[PDB]
Write a protein that binds this ligand. Structure first.
Ligand code: BCL
Ligand code: BCL
Ligand code: BCL
Ligand code: BCL
Ligand code: BCL
Ligand code: BCL
Ligand SMILES: CC[C@H]1c2cc3[nH]c4c(c3C)C(=O)[C@H](C(=O)OC)c4c3nc(cc4[nH]c(cc(n2)[C@@H]1C)c(C(C)=O)c4C)[C@@H](C)[C@@H]3CCC(=O)OC/C=C(\C)CCC[C@H](C)CCC[C@H](C)CCCC(C)C
Ligand SMILES: CC[C@H]1c2cc3[nH]c4c(c3C)C(=O)[C@H](C(=O)OC)c4c3nc(cc4[nH]c(cc(n2)[C@@H]1C)c(C(C)=O)c4C)[C@@H](C)[C@@H]3CCC(=O)OC/C=C(\C)CCC[C@H](C)CCC[C@H](C)CCCC(C)C
Ligand SMILES: COC1=C(OC)C(=O)C(C/C=C(\C)CC/C=C(\C)CC/C=C(\C)CC/C=C(\C)CC/C=C(\C)CC/C=C(\C)CC/C=C(\C)CCC=C(C)C)=C(C)C1=O
Ligand SMILES: COC(C)(C)C/C=C/C(C)=C/C=C/C(C)=C/C=C/C(C)=C/C=C\C=C(C)\C=C\C=C(C)\C=C\C=C(C)\C=C\CC(C)(C)OC
Ligand SMILES: [Ba+2]
Ligand SMILES: [Ba+2]
Ligand SMILES: [Ba+2]
Ligand SMILES: [Ba+2]
Ligand SMILES: [Ba+2]
Ligand SMILES: [Fe+3]
Lengths: 258, 40, 60, 318, 280, 60, 40, 60, 60, 40, 60, 40, 40, 40
């Protein structure tokens, strides 16, 4: 007998090998997925007083330490984060219900206006100088030949009212680019940051539109504990406020439509 | 890691007998298997 | 005189919870695996027609 | 309305940056920078400087040799009529040694140029590999690129070198031409019984679709959180921000689970490396192990049956 | 259940349609009006794919009927039905299932939209999704329409749709020569390259050799500039990758849109316009 | 059992945990490979009809 | 590797006989296999 | 002179851990490679059917 | 002395570590390369049946 | 190179011996192989 | 070696480390190239059966 | 290149001897290769 | 190229002699080659 | 070009003789080629 066809050939067993390595892979990636946001929040944990920490399958991976350059620290993941109150109240006491923000929605710091507490220190260049700084601090930087200089354009909110005018431009010392617009606010002549991501240009007009917030809201932009640099904490606090206007800045972004 | 030396002597003891029990059930199954259906 | 005599200390180095769960999992998988491997070969115990053919409730 | 972060609408310059300093041994850097207002429209406007060591120069060298053999051969094939060369270029190519030769080094006029271009190309590719590892070490970083490049090199080697040798025939490697190499692909599938029923090529296809899905999703995500400096993935990875939070949550509310700013890059990495790794496996088995994938799939009961509504009697059987 | 930093964002509102009616969560999925519609379209769709697997092409007792995962297949009606609704048991089922799939995808997209509105993030994801939805529509709606019959759509079956792709492709003799096809393939490939490069970079910097600290933006740029004399930069690579993937889908949609309706001859022949220019 | 003697110092260089797990993985894999190798050659012991053919315990 | 010079004699000592034990089990199964089914 | 005499100093130059592990890898891979090389040539030792064939070892 | 009477100076300009390790790699590849070269010619030593064809010995 | 001048004599002492041992295993296996099936 | 001008000044113009690297690389390329070209031409010196035939000294 | 003139003489010398030893092994292999199997 | 006038005499000198030695080696290889197997 | 007006004179001098040397070596090789193997 020189013909006993074997039913299992190298392709079968190699597809088997694949699937096994695959399963181990999937599991592993799902473990890296829980280095943040975990263990979850249920009323299972609170009902049980905590004896039910929510983690699911697979489980959480041993902490990993990131050693920040420049006397920066040591970060871990997963870590234990202190709970933080919610600046809102349950739309329903029933589970899975959303919460309505407490007070003036843009002030709430809840919803599209929420944000975490990032360090109260600055991101740094390789050298260790504040990465994000204004062009006034970053002497060297310069507009690109043929690009309207933002400096001096008018910042205008979502309803067409002037907000202020661009008093300067913040830039990345690590990856040369416009990160922030500075706004000398009209209504109180105080200085605020405006993320580039929220700013639209109107070059022929030398304007800088903002669908995000209303001209007035520019008055409440979170502020810098120092005008020649900004902290990680402050970047989040700045952007999130503007983000809030996306759902709050009008009594209509709230939805529905019909 | 984080057991005293006494509880990994203990753990090793209980583990060892437990595993050997599994080896037992398996050897059981393999003998029945050899009986009903020789493969060699 | 030999040395296999401090082979408990393994639970000071490799997490027991993990080694256990690892083993439990590994075995369940290996079981399903081998079962399928034999099932694709001659030693199959399903499609053998033993001891009373069920597709033979008639002339089969 | 709101900016989409597609086009840097207003750019800024600073003196070019020659970069982080390499330790002793990593030679100077050459060339002096320039800025392209248009690249700048969409990305870092800085063009270079570049590093060129022994490795890099020896690779540029081998690689250009290989490109010359392929090209010169193509001009030769239309008789040095550069007009004709220009006309049929898409169809021009350097075919491999014929089978009569097996794995022997063949005469210039019969494929020996292909073996020389194949030789030099591979060497130049693997030298570019080493290059990227050196370039990756001088910076204290890890070898993630090098492990992926090593995967893509794997597929390459599987295509033109490993399978041919195993099959004992340089004629089985792929020929250098645009349309010619398209034909090699099609003929390849036909010869081995429809490559669609080859499981490994299905997975590699799932991973290619997947590299498109993942980069599309992640990229869309990161731009959508580009208002929170989500592109700055490094610090969102060390000091999680509302960018990485809104990002992970968008997906959480849509499909029920999510990853993190650091981990999505692991899903992406592994999925790309997977295309090339299933792909090479797929070619490895063609002819060496399985000769007719449609048949293989029938043997494993995966091929569908349709009502036989049209059919033809086999003349070989009359 | 929520992430450990999720409650602070679970705001009310943002719908397009529904308002407080379906404005709630279930586990980790957000529901919303389009989720309810979506779940309906989806469930009925799948449940029908289940009935098709149950009945088979010639009836539940036939040898062609099957529950084997690789072979179950629901195919469109013959061309003789043109754009009419065809009987359920003659490709009708496939038509309905299609309506459900299209509706589920469009619902899904709109639900990601309500979700962007909630979180205050850009709408890049559902826009990008809409390219796959577009691709799906040419493959089931546009093309078969331009071609006077829904039967030109691909069947819903794991390998049967592969067979579909195969014979439609081979009707043009050598599909590889389709120029939009060549484009789309290049984008799928380039996408695969950028993805592998970005992945590698981030993982190579946020996790460096032991003994080194998290790397920097300066490292990032210095590396790809060292190797290939250019670094498109962090932001932009997220921009490019999105370009590559969306374009890959685009050119796939156009590469198949032109295969029939705008080109009936074999595809290599198309390239004739190039061998016949009055330059040669 | 080194065999003599300061080749313990080898665990002063290469992490014991890592070395252990490395061997575990390496062996756990290799075993499967050669198992497979054996399955495709003369030493195949399953689809051999050894010692009696089982798909000939009925028909199929 | 954060070990003392004495506690890699220890690791080495246990490791070596265990490894050798494995080699033993192997040589046994291989002899059993060679008797039942020689490959050379 | 064949004799080195100051070639201890190489570990003043090359990280011992890395060179070691490097050798481990290079050797194990090379072993795998050439093994396969031998398996593909005349000198093959598995599919030889020596001294008695197992694939035609049964009448059944 | 008519000869590179100052040819130590090369290691004042070119990093000794890189040059050494580079040298090792270069030779290992060239060895691999030339071996492959010989294997492709008449001078091949494997698919030769030396000293006796093994694909035609065996009982059986 | 994170070693002292004495630990590159010592390491080296150990390396030389280990490598010669390994090469020993090698020349052994190859002579056995030459015995069963000479290849040159 | 007969005088030429001030053609040393080239090294005030061209960096020595780099020309070194250029020559090493270029020469290495050229060496393999011509070697293979010749290996690919009639002047082959390997696959010639020189001086004693190797493919019909063992397939025998 | 962070070396002094003494650690480039030291290096050059040791290198030369190592390189020559390797080359020695080379002519060794070439003689074995040439006796049983002349190539020119 | 950051050299003084004297390290362009020294480098040029050592360079020149080494290249001439190499050209020597080449002329050698070409002469051996020309004797054993003429191509002209 | 970061040079002085006299140091484009010197460069030119050295360049010119070096170049006439190359074109010359070339004319030589070309005659060498033409006697032994006419192409026109
Ligand atoms: C191939 C020829 C024979 C065959 C021969 C064998 C042989 C031989 C064996 C089996 C064995 C197994 N067979 Mg069988 N078997 C046959 C046909 C079948 C069929 C079927 C549909 O026909 C089935 C369902 C099974 C089922 C199984 C599994 C139940 C079992 C192995 C368990 C395992 O791997 O999990 C993984 C196992 C473990 C992790 C250890 C078991 C412990 C359990 C799972 C508990 C885990 C601990 C958990 C944490 C709970 C804690 C415990 C509390 C503290 C008390 N066999 C065929 C006919 N079968 C094996 C066995 O042992 O069972 C007899 C075995 O050796
Ligand atoms: C044509 C008939 C068959 C077909 C036959 C094949 C064959 C045959 C192959 C594929 C291959 C692939 N096919 Mg297919 N394929 C078909 C239908 C499809 C369909 C579809 C919608 O139907 C899809 C999506 C795919 C998709 C794919 C990819 C997933 C896969 C490998 C991708 C890749 O990038 O590797 C490409 C990447 C590389 C090769 C690595 C590149 C790295 C190198 C080193 C770069 C060097 C650059 C160079 C040095 C720069 C200098 C340039 C010089 C000029 C050279 N195929 C039809 C059914 N397909 C592969 C496969 O699956 O095999 C199992 C393959 O080889
Ligand atoms: C068979 C002979 C021809 C061939 C004929 C064809 C034909 C015919 C076609 C292609 C198609 C394509 N081919 Mg081809 N192709 C060939 C050779 C190749 C080769 C190769 C290596 O040679 C490659 C790489 C490709 C690759 C490509 C891609 C460019 C393209 C498909 C992209 C796509 O579908 O996007 C679109 C993505 C989608 C439509 C998915 C949309 C997602 C929807 C909205 C969501 C689905 C959700 C669903 C429910 C998910 C389930 C999840 C569960 C619910 C949990 N072909 C051979 C030569 N090829 C197709 C094309 O051109 O583009 C359409 C096509 O029609
Ligand atoms: C028996 C039929 C198959 C076989 C099937 C398996 C299976 C199944 C397994 C192994 C496993 C192992 N096999 Mg095996 N193995 C065989 C042929 C060999 C040969 C050989 C020279 O032919 C060798 C060296 C090996 C070596 C080994 C090890 C590599 C490995 C387990 C221990 C280990 O890794 O540490 C190294 C161990 C050693 C160096 C000791 C060498 C092992 C024995 C003594 C060698 C037997 C051949 C020897 C020359 C004596 C032959 C008898 C005389 C001819 C009379 N096998 C034959 C071809 N082998 C196990 C494994 O890989 O996972 C751990 C496993 O599960
Ligand atoms: C026709 C050809 C012959 C053949 C002829 C040879 C020859 C000739 C040789 C081998 C050798 C090997 N063969 Mg064989 N071999 C054949 C058939 C087989 C079969 C089979 C299935 O039939 C198998 C499994 C093997 C298996 C093996 C491998 C186990 C082994 C090479 C190990 C290696 O790569 O280095 C990687 C291994 C190591 C680097 C050592 C592992 C050390 C461990 C990890 C460290 C322990 C800790 C230590 C105490 C302290 C730390 C020290 C440092 C880590 C170093 N052979 C056929 C029959 N085989 C080689 C050998 O004998 O060993 C050199 C060899 O020379
Ligand atoms: C086709 C006709 C002859 C042939 C004619 C020649 C001729 C003619 C020459 C060579 C030369 C070389 N040949 Mg041969 N050679 C033949 C067959 C072979 C075979 C073989 C397996 O059959 C091999 C391995 C070689 C190998 C070699 C290289 C060792 C050597 C240098 C060139 C080089 O490495 O390129 C790339 C590397 C370089 C160019 C080196 C550049 C670096 C610096 C300038 C030089 C130092 C390098 C190194 C230390 C020198 C080592 C060799 C010394 C002479 C001892 N030849 C065929 C049979 N060979 C050259 C030589 O011998 O050296 C003069 C040469 O001129
Ligand atoms: C998951 C696998 C995916 C992938 C990954 C991948 N590709 C990679 C890598 C990785 C990880 C690299 O590290 C490497 C890279 O460099 O990335 C930018 C690369 C690479 N992928 C590339 C191509 C490539 N990869 C592909 C595929 C894939 N690669 C998969 C999608 C494809 C396909 C099939 O479409 C292609 C075409 C290259 C850009 C690069 C490898 C380049 C290389 O090997 O270089 C060899 C040598 C040369 C090309 C010679 C240089 C020619 C110069 C342009 C001439 C310059 C002349 C100069 C002015 C000097 C003057 C000349 C003197 C002689 C006078
Ligand atoms: C356009 C660029 C790439 C892209 C983009 C893209 N896709 C996306 C997104 C984006 C940006 C999302 O945000 C969205 C998502 O949720 O992320 C996972 C999505 C999506 N990408 C997915 C699939 C997908 N995308 C693909 C491709 C692409 N999508 C391109 C490569 C592909 C392929 C074929 O390569 C697939 C398979 C989904 C997981 C998800 C959208 C899922 C969804 O909307 O769920 C609702 C619908 C259901 C749950 C099922 C409805 C039930 C139906 C009635 C039955 C289905 C019938 C079907 C037609 C039969 C097909 C049978 C098959 C066997 C052939
Ligand atoms: C961490 O961040 C990172 C960096 O930052 C530091 C990096 O620098 C880097 C280095 C990155 C790089 C060097 C980028 C490398 C990119 C490569 C190699 C890609 C190759 C691309 C090319 C050669 C160019 C190809 C494209 C063209 C020529 C343009 C052609 C135009 C065409 C065909 C017509 C356009 C029209 C269409 C396509 C039709 C419709 C399309 C759409 C609707 C798409 C929509 C797109 C968007 C973006 C919204 C990485 C990897 C990184 O991860
Ligand atoms: C007029 O033109 C001038 C400028 C001269 C130059 C022009 C050049 C041009 C325009 C060239 C154009 C080239 C093109 C378009 C090439 C396209 C090539 C394509 C599309 C190739 C596609 C696939 C090819 C593959 C996968 C090749 C694989 C080959 C391999 C892997 C070969 C391996 C060979 C090896 C490792 C050799 C070993 C030799 C040994 C050592 C074994 O010999 C003993
Ligand atoms: Ba004409
Ligand atoms: Ba049976
Ligand atoms: Ba044999
Ligand atoms: Ba047998
Ligand atoms: Ba021979
Ligand atoms: Fe990213």
């Amino acid at each position: 007998s020189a013909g006993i066809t074997h039913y299992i050939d190298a392709a079968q067993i190699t597809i088997w090998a694949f699937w096994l390595f695959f399963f181990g892979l999937i599991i592993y990636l799902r473990r890296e997925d829980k280095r943040e946001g975990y263990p979850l929040d249920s009323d299972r944990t609170e009902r049980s007083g905590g004896r039910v920490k929510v983690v699911g399958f697979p489980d959480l991976p041993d902490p990993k330490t990131f050693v920040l350059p420049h006397n920066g620290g040591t970060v871990v993941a997963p870590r234990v984060e202190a709970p933080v109150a919610v600046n809102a109240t349950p739309f329903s006491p029933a589970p899975g219900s959303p919460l309505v923000p407490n007070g003036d929605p843009m002030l709430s710091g809840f919803g599209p206006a929420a944000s975490p507490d990032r360090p109260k220190h600055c991101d740094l260049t390789f050298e260790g100088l504040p990465k994000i700084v204004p062009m006034r601090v970053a002497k060297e930087f310069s507009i690109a030949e043929g690009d309207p200089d933002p400096r001096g354009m008018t910042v205008v909110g979502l309803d067409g009212e002037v907000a202020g005018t661009v008093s300067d431009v913040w830039v990345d010392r690590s990856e040369p680019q416009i990160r922030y617009l500075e706004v000398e606010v009209a209504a109180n002549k105080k200085k605020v940051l405006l993320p580039i991501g929220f700013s639209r240009f109107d070059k022929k007009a030398r304007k800088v539109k903002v669908d995000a917030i209303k001209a007035a809201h520019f008055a409440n932009v979170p502020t810098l504990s120092n005008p020649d640099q900004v902290t990680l904490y402050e970047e989040d606090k700045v952007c999130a406020y503007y983000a809030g206007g996306k759902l709050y800045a009008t009594a209509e972004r709230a939805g529905p439509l019909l | 890691t984080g057991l005293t030396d006494d509880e990994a002597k203990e753990f090793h003891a209980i583990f060892m007998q437990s595993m050997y029990a599994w080896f037992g059930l398996v050897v059981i199954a393999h003998l029945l298997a050899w009986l009903y259906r020789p493969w060699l | 005189f030999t040395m296999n005599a401090n082979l408990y200390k393994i639970w000071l180095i490799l997490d027991p919870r993990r080694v256990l769960v690892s083993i439990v999992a590994f075995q369940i998988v290996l079981g399903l695996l081998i079962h399928m491997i034999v099932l694709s070969t001659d030693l199959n115990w399903l499609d053998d027609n033993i001891p009373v053919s069920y597709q033979a409730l008639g002339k089969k | 309305p709101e900016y989409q972060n597609i086009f840097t609408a207003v750019q800024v310059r600073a003196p070019a940056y020659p970069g982080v300093p390499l330790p002793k041994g990593n030679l100077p850097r050459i060339g002096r920078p320039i800025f392209s207002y248009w690249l700048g429209k969409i990305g870092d406007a800085q063009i270079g400087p570049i590093y060129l060591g022994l490795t890099g120069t020896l690779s540029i060298f081998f690689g250009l040799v290989a490109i010359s053999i392929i090209g010169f051969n193509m001009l030769a094939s239309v008789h040095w009529d550069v007009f004709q060369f220009l006309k049929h270029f898409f169809w021009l190519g350097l075919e491999p040694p014929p089978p009569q030769y097996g794995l022997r080094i063949p005469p210039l006029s019969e494929g020996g140029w292909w073996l020389m271009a194949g030789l030099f190309l591979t060497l130049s590719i693997l030298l570019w590999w080493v290059r990227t590892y050196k370039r990756a070490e001088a910076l204290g970083m890890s070898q993630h690129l090098s492990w992926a490049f090593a995967a893509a090199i794997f597929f390459y080697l599987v295509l033109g070198f490993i399978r041919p040798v195993m099959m004992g025939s340089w004629a089985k490697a792929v020929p250098f031409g645009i349309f010619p190499h398209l034909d090699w692909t099609a003929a390849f599938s036909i010869r081995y019984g429809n490559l669609y029923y080859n499981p490994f090529h299905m997975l590699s296809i799932a991973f290619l679709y997947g590299s498109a899905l993942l980069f599309a999703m992640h990229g869309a995500t990161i731009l959508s959180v580009s208002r929170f400096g989500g592109d700055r993935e490094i610090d969102q990875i060390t000091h999680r921000g509302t960018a990485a939070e809104r990002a992970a949550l968008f997906w959480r509310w849509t499909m029920g689970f999510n990853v993190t700013m650091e981990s999505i890059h692991r899903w992406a990495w592994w999925c790309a490396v997977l295309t090339v790794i299933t792909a090479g496996i797929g070619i490895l088995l063609s002819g060496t192990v399985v000769d007719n994938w449609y048949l293989w799939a029938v043997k494993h009961g995966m091929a569908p049956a349709y009502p036989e509504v049209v059919t033809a009697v086999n003349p070989y059987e009359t | 259940a929520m992430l450990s930093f999720e409650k602070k964002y679970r705001v009310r509102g943002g719908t397009l349609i529904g308002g407080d009616l379906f404005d709630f969560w279930v586990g980790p999925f957000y529901v919303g009006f389009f989720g309810v519609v979506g779940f309906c379209f989806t469930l009925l769709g799948v449940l029908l794919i289940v009935w098709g697997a149950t009945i088979g092409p010639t009836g539940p007792t036939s040898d062609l009927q099957t529950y084997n995962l690789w072979r179950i297949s629901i195919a469109p009606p013959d061309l003789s039905y043109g754009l009419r609704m065809a009987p359920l048991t003659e490709g009708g089922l496939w038509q309905i299932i299609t309506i459900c799939a299209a509706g589920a995808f469009i619902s899904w997209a709109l639900r990601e939209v309500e979700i962007c509105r909630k979180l205050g993030i850009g709408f890049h994801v559902p826009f990008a999704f809409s390219f796959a939805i577009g691709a799906y529509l040419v493959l089931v709606f546009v093309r078969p329409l331009l071609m006077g019959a829904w039967g030109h759509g691909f069947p819903y079956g794991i390998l049967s749709h592969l067979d579909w792709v195969s014979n439609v492709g081979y009707q043009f003799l050598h599909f590889h020569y389709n120029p939009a096809h060549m484009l789309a393939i290049s984008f799928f490939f380039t996408n695969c390259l950028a993805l592998s490069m970005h992945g590698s970079l981030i993982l190579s910097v946020t996790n460096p050799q032991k003994g080194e600290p998290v790397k920097t933006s300066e490292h990032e740029n210095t590396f790809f500039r060292d190797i290939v004399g250019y670094s498109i930069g962090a932001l932009a690579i997220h921009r490019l990758g999105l370009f590559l993937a969306l374009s890959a889908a685009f050119w796939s949609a156009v590469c198949i849109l032109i295969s029939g309706p705008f080109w009936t001859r074999g595809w290599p022949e198309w390239w004739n316009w190039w061998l016949e220019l009055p330059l040669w």
